[PDB]
Design an enzyme around this catalytic site. Structure first.
Site, PDB file in Angstrom:
ATOM      1  N   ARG A   1       0.820  -1.229   0.000  1.00 29.13           N
ATOM      2  CA  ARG A   1       0.000   0.000   0.000  1.00 29.13           C
ATOM      3  C   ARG A   1       0.849   1.272   0.000  1.00 29.13           C
ATOM      4  NH1 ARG A   1      -2.775  -1.078   5.961  1.00 29.13           N
ATOM      5  NH2 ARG A   1      -0.732  -1.184   7.010  1.00 29.13           N
TER       6      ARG A   1
ATOM      7  N   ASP B   1       0.831  -9.494   4.869  1.00 27.64           N
ATOM      8  CA  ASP B   1      -0.499  -9.063   4.434  1.00 27.64           C
ATOM      9  C   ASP B   1      -1.583 -10.141   4.570  1.00 27.64           C
ATOM     10  OD1 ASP B   1      -0.866  -6.340   2.126  1.00 27.64           O
ATOM     11  OD2 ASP B   1       0.336  -6.482   3.988  1.00 27.64           O
ATOM     12  N   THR B   2      -1.236 -11.377   4.208  1.00 22.39           N
ATOM     13  CA  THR B   2      -2.137 -12.527   4.364  1.00 22.39           C
ATOM     14  C   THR B   2      -2.599 -12.715   5.811  1.00 22.39           C
ATOM     15  OG1 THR B   2      -0.212 -13.936   4.646  1.00 22.39           O
ATOM     16  CG2 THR B   2      -1.331 -14.010   2.495  1.00 22.39           C
TER      17      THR B   2
ATOM     18  N   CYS C   1       1.300 -23.035   0.129  1.00 19.40           N
ATOM     19  CA  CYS C   1       1.933 -22.101   1.093  1.00 19.40           C
ATOM     20  C   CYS C   1       2.935 -22.817   1.957  1.00 19.40           C
ATOM     21  CB  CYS C   1       0.895 -21.420   2.012  1.00 19.40           C
ATOM     22  SG  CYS C   1       1.662 -20.287   3.192  1.00 19.40           S
ATOM     23  N   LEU C   2       4.176 -22.354   1.966  1.00 20.49           N
ATOM     24  CA  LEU C   2       5.164 -22.957   2.874  1.00 20.49           C
ATOM     25  C   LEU C   2       4.952 -22.554   4.339  1.00 20.49           C
ATOM     26  CD1 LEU C   2       8.537 -23.025   1.016  1.00 20.49           C
ATOM     27  CD2 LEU C   2       7.113 -24.932   1.605  1.00 20.49           C
ATOM     28  N   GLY C   3       4.347 -21.379   4.533  1.00 27.48           N
ATOM     29  CA  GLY C   3       4.019 -20.894   5.891  1.00 27.48           C
ATOM     30  C   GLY C   3       2.729 -21.404   6.488  1.00 27.48           C
TER      31      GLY C   3
HETATM   32  C1  HEM Z   1      -3.495 -16.720   6.306  1.00 31.56           C
HETATM   33  C2  HEM Z   1      -2.161 -16.811   6.034  1.00 31.56           C
HETATM   34  C3  HEM Z   1      -1.588 -17.245   4.666  1.00 31.56           C
HETATM   35  C4  HEM Z   1      -2.234 -17.473   3.517  1.00 31.56           C
HETATM   36  C5  HEM Z   1      -3.739 -17.396   3.197  1.00 31.56           C
HETATM   37  C6  HEM Z   1      -1.265 -17.798   2.509  1.00 31.56           C
HETATM   38  C7  HEM Z   1      -1.546 -18.104   1.205  1.00 31.56           C
HETATM   39  C8  HEM Z   1      -0.588 -18.522   0.302  1.00 31.56           C
HETATM   40  C9  HEM Z   1      -0.848 -18.975  -1.050  1.00 31.56           C
HETATM   41  C10 HEM Z   1      -2.233 -19.068  -1.726  1.00 31.56           C
HETATM   42  C11 HEM Z   1       0.334 -19.302  -1.599  1.00 31.56           C
HETATM   43  C12 HEM Z   1       0.567 -19.858  -3.034  1.00 31.56           C
HETATM   44  C13 HEM Z   1       0.533 -18.754  -4.091  1.00 31.56           C
HETATM   45  C14 HEM Z   1       0.658 -19.327  -5.503  1.00 31.56           C
HETATM   46  O1  HEM Z   1       0.408 -20.538  -5.767  1.00 31.56           O
HETATM   47  O2  HEM Z   1       1.003 -18.543  -6.413  1.00 31.56           O
HETATM   48  C15 HEM Z   1       1.357 -19.063  -0.612  1.00 31.56           C
HETATM   49  C16 HEM Z   1       2.699 -19.291  -0.834  1.00 31.56           C
HETATM   50  C17 HEM Z   1       3.753 -19.059   0.000  1.00 31.56           C
HETATM   51  N1  HEM Z   1       3.634 -18.669   1.320  1.00 31.56           N
HETATM   52 FE1  HEM Z   1       1.787 -18.264   2.248  1.00 31.56          FE
HETATM   53  N2  HEM Z   1      -0.005 -17.772   3.091  1.00 31.56           N
HETATM   54  C18 HEM Z   1      -0.166 -17.426   4.397  1.00 31.56           C
HETATM   55  C19 HEM Z   1       0.845 -17.296   5.299  1.00 31.56           C
HETATM   56  C20 HEM Z   1       2.196 -17.449   5.086  1.00 31.56           C
HETATM   57  C21 HEM Z   1       3.199 -17.260   6.108  1.00 31.56           C
HETATM   58  C22 HEM Z   1       2.892 -16.920   7.594  1.00 31.56           C
HETATM   59  C23 HEM Z   1       4.393 -17.443   5.546  1.00 31.56           C
HETATM   60  C24 HEM Z   1       5.741 -17.393   6.288  1.00 31.56           C
HETATM   61  C25 HEM Z   1       6.576 -16.379   6.069  1.00 31.56           C
HETATM   62  C26 HEM Z   1       4.171 -17.772   4.140  1.00 31.56           C
HETATM   63  C27 HEM Z   1       5.137 -18.089   3.198  1.00 31.56           C
HETATM   64  C28 HEM Z   1       4.896 -18.520   1.919  1.00 31.56           C
HETATM   65  C29 HEM Z   1       5.914 -18.839   0.947  1.00 31.56           C
HETATM   66  C30 HEM Z   1       7.446 -18.812   1.117  1.00 31.56           C
HETATM   67  C31 HEM Z   1       5.167 -19.213  -0.321  1.00 31.56           C
HETATM   68  C32 HEM Z   1       5.862 -19.659  -1.634  1.00 31.56           C
HETATM   69  C33 HEM Z   1       5.682 -21.164  -1.853  1.00 31.56           C
HETATM   70  C34 HEM Z   1       6.328 -21.529  -3.184  1.00 31.56           C
HETATM   71  O3  HEM Z   1       6.321 -20.729  -4.147  1.00 31.56           O
HETATM   72  O4  HEM Z   1       6.881 -22.628  -3.288  1.00 31.56           O
HETATM   73  N3  HEM Z   1       2.813 -17.772   3.893  1.00 31.56           N
HETATM   74  N4  HEM Z   1       0.761 -18.613   0.555  1.00 31.56           N
END
Ligand code: HEM
Length: 404
Positions: free
Chosen positions: A176, A241-242, A347-349
């Site tokens: 933002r 942001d998520t 999502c890795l997180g």
């Molecule tokens: C409500 C919380 C969260 C939601 C809804 C969420 C959602 C997502 C989604 C939908 C993706 C895949 C995007 C795609 O396919 O293009 C993603 C990927 C990813 N997320 Fe999250 N996420 C959340 C929290 C987190 C947290 C807390 C972390 C830790 C820092 C994190 C780290 C990552 C990483 C590193 C990827 C890349 C995975 C890859 O490309 O191999 N996420 N997330």
């Protein structure tokens, strides 16, 4: 009206001009606004002329199938519109290479790191909530939802408290911008910050996330500083942001539904299931893929270079996947969703996010069981790649609250 002219290969009966940054029914709530794409007169796969022109898959089955098929649906260009400089890893990479950087990123946010962190996570939540508790009010988004994930990142990454305001400014500009900086400038500023820390922990490693990423192996060789900065980058912004906006939707619903609050107060063992069902109901990501070649997908001719939006948000809301999908029911026998994505970029997180949500709910509901939306306040949503909540003014009676 900002409608890109219809490509010749797209039949007119498939046209539905949804605007993902400004959907028509936003004031009804952002999930409700996207659910329009699931009314029965709306095909499973549509083209919108908004935002440059692009496909949208509207049903869970199609969304999953395309996330699975990375050979046709590539991550090289995951954001709509196309002209929207993004070099984070592994988000813009397809397999095979994506899998290397993923295994490394998993050593820093994987389930056993999450188990290690659980009570550090609880201690952070408790100190945030305790400082608000006697005020009888807060902007939840501003006072808890934002400070919480960025403090978790400092913990994981072994970074000092004093860096938080500057790091939060930089990440705020990416999603933002107030105009001080371009996206690229925020990115490079972010990189300025992380480069020296990566160089130094290559040399004198900790047991923290930057130390782990800096000292990692890719395709048989060590990671380059450049690859490391671009990963560490995603590790920061991916969990802000998520989490901030998800926690906000969940708190908004709990503040509007005393009965759902009561259910979790009386049965806190249901809080992990309630977490799952909130993640389905208030799912909030919508990114996309790009067509690697001409491809016929479910009777629809797709062209090489077409973008297709595959809204993670929509799978759990699809009435073919969950009955009465707008109804929140913590006892759903089968909670089906793709809130954390599906396929090789899942999502890795996701494990860190569920713990963040669970701990938030457990800790808030025990210290501040009874809370409401501030009298008069109308809650406003916003819509994009990560949809969310503009602000969440909450109020409670401090006498109805527990020092813990
Ligand atoms: C409500 C919380 C969260 C939601 C809804 C969420 C959602 C997502 C989604 C939908 C993706 C895949 C995007 C795609 O396919 O293009 C993603 C990927 C990813 N997320 Fe999250 N996420 C959340 C929290 C987190 C947290 C807390 C972390 C830790 C820092 C994190 C780290 C990552 C990483 C590193 C990827 C890349 C995975 C890859 O490309 O191999 N996420 N997330």
């Amino acid at each position: 009206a900002n409608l890109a002219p219809l490509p010749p290969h797209v039949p007119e009966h498939l046209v539905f001009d949804f605007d993902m940054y400004n959907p028509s029914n936003l004031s009804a709530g952002v999930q409700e606004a996207w659910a329009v794409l699931q009314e029965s007169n709306v095909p499973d796969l549509v083209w919108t002329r908004c935002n440059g022109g692009h496909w949208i898959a509207t049903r869970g089955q199609l969304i999953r199938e395309a996330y699975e098929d990375y050979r046709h649906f590539s991550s090289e260009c995951p954001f709509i519109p196309r002209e929207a400089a993004y070099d984070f890893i592994p988000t813009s990479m397809d397999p095979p290479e994506q899998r290397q950087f993923r295994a490394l990123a998993n050593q820093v946010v994987g389930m056993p790191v999450v188990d290690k962190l659980e009570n550090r996570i609880q201690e952070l939540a408790c100190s945030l909530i305790e400082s608000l508790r006697p005020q009888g009010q807060c902007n939840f988004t501003e006072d808890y939802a934002e400070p919480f994930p960025i403090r978790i990142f400092m913990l994981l990454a072994g970074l000092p408290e004093e860096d938080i305001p500057h790091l939060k400014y930089l990440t705020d500009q990416m999603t933002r911008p107030d105009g001080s900086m371009t996206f690229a400038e925020a990115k490079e500023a972010l990189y300025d910050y992380l480069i020296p820390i990566i160089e130094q922990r290559r040399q004198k490693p900790g047991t923290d996330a930057i130390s782990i990423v800096a000292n990692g192996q890719v395709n048989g060789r060590p990671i380059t500083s450049d690859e490391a900065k671009r990963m560490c980058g995603l590790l920061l912004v991916g969990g802000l942001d998520t989490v901030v906006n998800f926690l906000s939707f969940s708190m908004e619903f709990l503040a509007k539904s005393p009965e759902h609050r009561q259910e979790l107060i009386e049965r806190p063992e249901r809080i992990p299931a309630a977490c799952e069902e909130l993640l389905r109901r208030f799912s909030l990501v919508a990114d996309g893929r790009i067509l690697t070649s001409d491809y016929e997908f479910h009777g629809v001719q797709l062209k090489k270079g077409d973008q297709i939006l595959l809204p993670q948000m929509l799978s759990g809301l699809d009435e073919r996947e969950n009955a009465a999908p707008m109804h929140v029911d913590f006892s759903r026998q089968k909670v089906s969703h793709t809130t954390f994505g599906h396929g090789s970029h899942l999502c890795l997180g996701q494990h860190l996010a569920r713990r963040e949500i669970i701990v938030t709910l457990k800790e808030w509901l025990t210290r501040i069981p009874d809370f409401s939306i501030a009298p008069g306040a109308q809650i406003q949503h916003k819509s994009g790649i990560v949809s969310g909540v503009q602000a969440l003014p909450l109020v409670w009676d401090p006498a109805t609250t527990k020092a813990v």
